[model samples]
Target: SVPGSLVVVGGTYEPWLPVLEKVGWRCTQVADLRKPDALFVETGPCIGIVDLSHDEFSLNGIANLVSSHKQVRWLAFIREAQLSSDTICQFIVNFCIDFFTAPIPDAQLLSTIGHQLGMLKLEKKVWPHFGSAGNMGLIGESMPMKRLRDQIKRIGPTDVSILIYGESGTGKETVAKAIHKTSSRAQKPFISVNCRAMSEKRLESELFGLGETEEGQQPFLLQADGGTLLLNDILTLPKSQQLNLLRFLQEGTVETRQGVRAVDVRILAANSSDIEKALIDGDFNEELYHYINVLRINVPSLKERASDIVLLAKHFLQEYSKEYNAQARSFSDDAVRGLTRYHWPGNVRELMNQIKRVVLMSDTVVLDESQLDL
Candidate 1:
């Protein structure tokens, strides 16, 4: 029997159809593309398996269904030949959680389905248990954020440079700081430079250090010689600067414009733009992109992980209460509902700002929707 809810999409029946039924999945097999929308909306399954053996729906149609229902975990079954096709590969890459190329063994198929179900259960269990570590300062328990944190724990210890990528206000810098604090470099200086805030010349001088005397100016890189140097919004760095950065990454040496001594620095760069798109647009250098992206981490948007909304809101309320000298304050159920429903386009930073405003402006102990601008 299946451990939890499952919904099968596409196809009428197959040799493994009995096996799927035996596992307790409420299968709603559809053979027509026109019927999938109504079935998916009405059934609303936590998991949806797409069988590509049926020709009723094209890859684009499957992608459309998946896109419409972002909550469902989609699994695809494809023939070995279809796996090599560009369309099939992109479909799997963009939409499905996992896919099985067929001539599938019954045992392996059963195990894969079971494992996916187990993972979903574990994700539900862990979704509300964040913030155990006091100093980490991160406040999300959604599976995506937990997975991101787990990746950081695994990679933060090593001496290699890390490239963090995310949208603005997604807490990329926060992740970088957390990694640095948790790693052996905690004692060493953690320097963060916003490459977008300064011109290329000033940024280079700021990074490499300009001497006050003729010979004594030490660049920021020298200051971060034994520590971590964060290049925030790295895509803003000019092409000339990127070439200079690539040299530093390759040789651990930053040669200043003034023909000064080279400095060794461990560089951690963060970019809000899509690196692939930036490379295509010629905004970012290809060699520097590959060099700095040795270890890549992505922070998910707040809307993508709505499970953490309550936890993060409560934490921010407490934090702002202390900051604003408010006697205990709490969010009303309606306010919480509104918060969850609203699309947080600005991610964590925007949430923090809203929480602060509500705490400061609220007259009563309980926070209400009136305090929220939205």
Candidate 2:
């Protein structure tokens, strides 16, 4: 028996009391529906099991409670006959962490409860730094997004060079920023150089800063020393600049244009292109690609995780409302449908821009679908 916390509401004592006691859970029995809001907030249980036996415990109320405290995992217990109710089924689908039909087997109940408790513990331990100031604002509760967050937390503190690959506007820079923010060198400068924005002739000079004394003097790497140097669109660097970058990645040092001095720095590179294909096309250096690709993370597109659209939209709305002192606003159902239906080729950045625009333009309490262009 695990010493876990569980809250059971509106259930007949005979059905769940034994299992609750067996699991060593500190159960809060909410017999009255009118007091659910107060009860849930005060107890803050790891799991909430709602009983469908009572008519007073409305499904809409439970859903509102679940949506408000999204951090809390929820479970439902209902009669086999309740399955026929479309409303009950939809509520279970959207809000419940898991569901058990009436006459739930003792073994099944115990096992599912144990699994959820363990999952909550693991999530807390893996992301202890999640709510802290250094977090990278990468938001999502989906399995894939959670896995990515865990991976980022594990790798953020290390000095190993990281390569983030994602389509355009998929938050590659955001990932890099997260790593730097969580690292021991967080206090140091985090410099970003857009390789694609610079010409081949000027790329090396930009990365390894030009000499102050001479027009073509040796390059200086002090600008990025003891900190992160991000190479955005790293594949865009011409062959000549790629050689310079490769030299720095391997040796931790680079010579200036005038060959005056060598300096040490850490490299973090990002690219929207597929390096494997770029290598085949001779647009990217195979050796350089391999060298910096030591740690790779592929960010998912917004369309791939449509469930997150509403969540992200709500987050952005609240953020802008506070920043601009606009009235609190919410997306209309049609606006949400539009967001989920449209292909977000530009990913999170595009979503952020759209939200910003809505916050700036809309004055009503609820966001209108007609106001949104896409």
Candidate 3:
């Protein structure tokens, strides 16, 4: 029940058996899927890892297993060079949940297996159906959202300070997380600090640690070393600490009482306000703005992307339904129209909240505009 069982077919299982078994996967070996009575029924669900490195395996055998079991999520292992083969590519694209090429790190293989096992435990009917939301964690297919996704893919791999601009409740922090998730430093910590929430003194001490403390507290910058740090509400960042932040961005080092310590961290600044106006009003530092604004991402407001409103609403409905165990299944035509017609001053967050309210209060399978209170 803990980590579940895994069946490995068509490969020398002796090498990986001990590794997977140590990590709690009860490894079952079936040398050939075509053999009689190859798969066994288990009380808990199973995930299959087929070795595609060999040309000896039969595609029909895999197809039969996939159709017959239905429950087991299958993964494949293939040679990196053989990926160019149309046959192998088609097999993986059509039948496997995911595939890893040879020389796959044991840790990465284990991680993928663990993720697939977790998915098997969920009620599949409730999973989000649209968007690249499954892995991207972002919903919506509107042109604006599509452009945003493209921007993420391009900028994620680069190590630079990023400025994310958006209106209030427009998922600025979510965009920051997406960048961190796709970055090379994904395995490291992702620390987020809201500049608007804390007082100037507290914010100062948190970002640049108080070296005189008994515990020798570590600053947020250091805590997020070798990873990413998201500064939320960047427009509200105090002027006094602006120079220190600028220094860090310039030298990749923090000023500690002991000495200047260099730390590898990517900074993602998120703002829901107009930075140009802030600069004109002398509220924000000019030099610091240039440093952090090396790369900028504008998250489109909800009203501007009207086409995605209903799509996002449906996604939220399914998500909240599963969480609240509500009976509301789909939205009525009027409700769907009402969702798109509204200006949505609060953006996606507001839409999610409205859907959440309906899911918690309503008992009907089909929701109407009146139930939304829109």
Candidate 4:
């Protein structure tokens, strides 16, 4: 799990036990959900649960506290009587994903979040600084990254399709993850898929569950039920796969030999902003294009995010050092010239590769132009 702590209000105490055991949710409960609430006004379940089995006025006390720290997903466990009070009901509906009546919802409570912060699942647990959810954490604080963060926050609550346009290695997937990470389905799986070429039969099997599973087979459309499905490099996908995707989008259900199941997956597709030519030349499906074209995110390339290079370079350097036990802490002023030059042909991916190559190649505490070969 992420190297962080959790501060919970007076939620149903018993239910939180499993969350403590399963994930590393270190908890500190509030004495009472009262004023001067910073005592419990801190942060992760990576989820946050509140029980409305008591005083209604406490909601008023905690309202300011909740709005300030949205870095966690919040759920409500309420008594049925609490819903009778319009004030209580509205608060719960406004803030929570789902509600339960029992003393401890246990495993059920762990996955609920109405406000959304799937960041709790991201961390230095399974791997070092970067792992499965590493991309969830955007490294740079550049204007583009800041603006992107704002856009992601605004769009997180919606269930609409997203079209992210960016060059290769420009962290397009990271943009998709940001959108999904703060969504209502934060607790559910977020599956990222590349819409590259596939055997016609293999494509059909993935969408309709017609193919048999092997040891490492991907569940494809079915795997991301109740969460997100990110389709990257989507422009390169052939028309046959496009048709299958259109079916799933239109029907919201797929029938297969396995059985009929709801298409609970949310579609977040990415491709080059250069896809206009492909669309103009009839290389893409017009209907499919229009369907997922509802919401959009133009991910700026590394050259576009010129201001972020130094920040990204340093962040990656620090993270790499933690993993490699190195002391190459900073870059020389002359090194910054080489770092920022040459237009970043491979974008963020290339920059990361060079950083990794240089970090491994260098022996000194500081990185200079020699280490960062432009």
Candidate 5:
């Protein structure tokens, strides 16, 4: 009979229990979350409301509960004083859907619950493909991150050549991969070439393979046929190669071995620096830039989306922990502060490396800033 369920923890349910029941929420209240059986009651599917304003709650218990019950959406009721602790603030930001500072009116609280319920329903129906957008490998919820994902989704189905520009380590390739994964050619190969990594001869040979001989390397364009090819560090490409690439974009044909070969491959170019400057300086071919620039994306730097630091750090911790078989589980309060305050010069890649290092080197279940060495 109950369509909506609410699990109230930490004895804060008294203030809102009647209102919750009035609105058809089957409320299950818990006095303490740390106890083994605190959440043992069969509440079917539920939303969790935790009161952090009381000054005496176990974060370890909350962490365990939140991680274990991945499907449950949580909202935190906290006092302004609670926000002063970087630890609590980070926890709420990373785990809870949203939070209400103390002194929230009943009407506002009810509206928030109603909004979250709507969101829950929408996510259930819309996210049938993956559990969340995070599963797509783009794991930040910052406004910049959201905008970037929106751009990817819109352009994914199209076969337009795209230019992705961002600083090194800002996950430009990751963005390209997401677009490829979302596109019609997701089942095909995604070939990525760093133009800056190879010599002109090798680059040319690899990009447009030598005549179809037994010992000849396959052209990247050939390999990526019916898929996508990412030309990373594209500005570093030599002038001759640039014209060759421009020719391919214009004609969809590559000169390989004996003759010109036609291959259907979506071109996605990535640059770590400003391409406009390169274009103006005559270092990069303007025509090639124009072709790829038909669609473009600017990935935000880590410092620009610092709101996602805690979330990214937590994600990397979990990922590296499983891969490295390490014990480091979460960041300490000071570690969170350190991560937030530090301007990541190297961006998301740098953040992941730091977390990966800590996870590999430390047995400390909770990593402190010192362990991070940042």
Candidate 6:
């Protein structure tokens, strides 16, 4: 039997049916892109190819076609000059997996198509559903948490730098870890750098592995090469150092006292203060902010996640009790009410400390309002 694939050389052109058949490939076509479902039902999963030489099929027509048959791994052949057209470029970037310019070699063309076929055979994608909290590597099942998780997975594949904003103890670093966990760079090291205390010169020296006279030491950027760099004290760096950071990002290289080097480290930074105010205060460099703020994520405060507090509280208490060999099992109804009512100024981190304190200081099995000190 011939291997299955779909073809769309609709206009009169050099007929490939004869040569393709010689290679044991079964190729066919759909009468219309509007009827993708019908074509899918008839052939099941199949790779698709498009011929751009055909004047009858408009670019808009092709966009809608590929957008509809997302299951189909589409390849395309167009004139070499057609790639310069803005319309075709956008369409290819957004839609096609592989494309070849005209005068394309037959051997190369078949190899690309075969490669996509092999990939499609392996992946077998289906629509995803909401899973358990542990499944997403996040603790809360709250709506805000769900949205945050979805956002991370949605944007994790890109090389864009991410700016995560939240108050202290909102687990900004935790969210960064979660995003990296789902990212393509998950296998690479996740380096965490804190810049809260460094002076302008010290910050530049320690960060870029420059300014220092040492020869053997590696820069944080190089250490995090091919991986993610999580910066907790992002806005604390001096504006001069901020420009240094900005320059390195745009040029994709660093030219400091240590000598020039190429680096590829994706940044994921968290700022505790409001960014706009920081900019207004002349505390941050605009160019630096603009470069790294391509993607923005707001980490929800504990108050915003009122519904998840009790769940989070129990999770910590249970784990701590086992660790401490205490009998404390659950929070009393009064304790729950007390915790729910008080504004958690320190957020989730504070809640964890309170639970640890209660389990350590209390003698009773059931933790009550008295022990929590809410």
Tens digits of lDDT, candidate 5, 1-374: 23343333445436666778776677655554544233422222346655555365666765556555232323333333334455556665445666665465889878877887775464343233322354444657665665455445545667888878888988888877787877889999988877777887766677565433556456778779999988888888889788778778888897666566899998898888866698999998777778888876778888788788888888878877988778777778998898889888898888888777667779778888888863
- Clash count (model 1, backbone only): 5
For candidate 5, the per-residue lDDT at 372 reads: 82
- Give the candidate number with the greatest TM-score: 6
Candidate-wise lDDT, in order: 0.66, 0.65, 0.68, 0.64, 0.68, 0.68
Q: What value does the lDDT take at residue 364 in candidate 3?
A: 87
lDDT of 1 by residue, 122-231 (tens): 43432323343425446566667655654555567667877788778888778778888667877888888877778766655654444344555557776787889888
- List model 3 lDDT by residue over 318-369, tens digit each: 8889887888899999888888888888898888887777687897898988
Give candidate 3 regions above 4 Å deviation. 1-137, 255-260
lDDT of 1 at 232: 84
TM-score of each: 0.63, 0.60, 0.62, 0.61, 0.63, 0.64
Candidate order (lDDT): 5, 3, 6, 1, 2, 4
- Residue lDDT tens for model 2, 165-236: 778877787777777876788788778877677776556556555435366443335766777888788877
lDDT accuracy of residue 246 in candidate 1: 74
Residue pairs clashing in model 3 are none
lDDT of 1: 0.66
Give stretches of model 5 more than 4 Å off.
Answer: 1-137, 210-214
lDDT of 4 by residue, 1-374 (tens): 33222334444544445456557654444444453243322222234445445543366655555554332323323333333455456665444555555445555555553123353333212222222232534655665564455455555567888788878888788776767766788888888877665666776777765565533444566668888888888887778778878888898877555556776778889887487798889988888888898777767788877777877788888888879988788899889877777588778888888888888877899878877863
The order by descending TM-score is 6, 1, 5, 3, 4, 2
- Better by TM-score, candidate 5 or 2: 5
- What clash pairs does model 4 have? none
